[PDB]
């Protein structure tokens, strides 16, 4: 009893039913078993870091700190209770100074205290071969305070209260800090560097200028793709792409503050009247990548209220 005798009686047509059924279940089993395998063997995307001090940077494998150094540190706190000859870091007990120095200062550099002072006497300034590193670190703390009070303060609270600290630029490396690594120079010229020469509230402006051409537009686009890499959110993160001169998105204003801040870093600290002398940071001109590292908020940026008050955006 059938109405499709060419489909249910004849072996060729009768076979077509089984063929279709088997192909449908074969394709479904294909897709289902693939996605099953993929979801069972693939690890869960790593849980987002939750450290009290930092945004997404952790210092806590603190193996880099010798035992002799942590031992002498708590001994020093036990005996010396207020700090002795602090030049920055004015409002902190030697216990808080010590906790900050291990969590943020050496936790940002991932180095022992013997990297910067003699562990017998944390207080002595020029009694050891590594005193130059301590004066460099003190000047860097001054620089951090200056960047926090003079550029992070101008950013609204909607951004957050995140403050620049050691791990913000060092990210676990004491020396050998490389802004502009080869990872972020994918389609840019490898020689290209951020043009901190210009006056930045209007330095890369190109639209309708008529006194520039595609060469300046190309320089502008190199800088803008550098910002794209430094903050992975792409090009509309601070632009309404229908009109780039527009300040619609308000991350373009934060970026103006940040451009002024990195220009200030280069002019005041990288090369104050020449980088060879009287200049910290080893002639390493800054980049947005140096601390943002592919995030809109730098991973090594400290959460609001975690840096000392002297280094804070508001002191």
């Amino acid at each position: 009893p059938t109405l499709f005798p060419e489909i249910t009686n004849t072996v060729r047509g009768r076979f077509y039913i089984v063929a279709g059924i088997i192909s449908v279940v074969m394709a479904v089993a294909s897709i289902a078993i693939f996605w099953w395998i993929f979801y069972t063997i693939t690890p869960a995307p790593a849980p987002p870091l939750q450290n009290p001090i930092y945004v997404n940077y952790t210092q806590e494998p603190t193996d880099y700190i010798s035992a002799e150094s942590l031992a002498a540190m708590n001994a020093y706190i036990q005996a010396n209770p207020q700090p002795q000859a602090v030049q920055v870091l004015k409002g902190m007990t030697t216990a808080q100074i010590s906790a900050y120095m291990v969590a943020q200062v050496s936790g940002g550099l991932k180095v022992d205290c013997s990297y910067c002072h003699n562990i017998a006497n944390f207080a002595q300034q020029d009694g050891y071969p590594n005193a130059a590193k301590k004066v460099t670190a003190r000047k860097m703390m001054l620089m951090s305070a200056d960047l926090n009070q003079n550029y992070t303060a101008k950013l609204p609270a909607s951004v957050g209260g995140y403050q620049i600290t050691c791990a913000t630029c060092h990210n676990g490396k004491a020396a050998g800090l490389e802004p502009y690594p080869i990872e972020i120079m994918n389609t840019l010229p490898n020689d290209w560097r951020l043009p901190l020469e210009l006056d930045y509230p209007g330095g890369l402006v190109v639209t309708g200028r008529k006194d520039v051409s595609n060469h300046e537009v190309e320089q502008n686009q190199f800088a803008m793709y550098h910002m794209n890499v430094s903050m992975g959110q792409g090009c509309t993160f601070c632009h309404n792409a229908r009109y780039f001169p527009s300040y619609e998105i308000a991350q373009k204003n934060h970026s103006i503050i940040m451009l002024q801040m990195t220009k200030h870093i280069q002019e005041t600290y990288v090369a104050p009247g020449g980088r060879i002398a009287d200049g910290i940071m080893a002639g390493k001109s800054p980049s947005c990548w140096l601390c943002h590292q592919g995030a809109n908020i730098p991973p090594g940026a400290a959460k609001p209220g975690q840096v000392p008050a002297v280094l804070s955006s508001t002191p």
């Binding site: 063929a19 192909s23 074969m26 394709a27 294909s30 693939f34 395998i37 993929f38 063997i41 693939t42 690890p43």
Partner: protein, 35 residues
Amino acid sequence: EFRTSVVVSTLLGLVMALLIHFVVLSSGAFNWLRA
């Protein structure tokens, strides 16, 4: 056609094998090729 089913099944199997190998190797779950 039997040739069509053979082509489709063989290509699906090869694509599946490559996909599963790549998913398993990228997962870093099994200790294969220093993972």
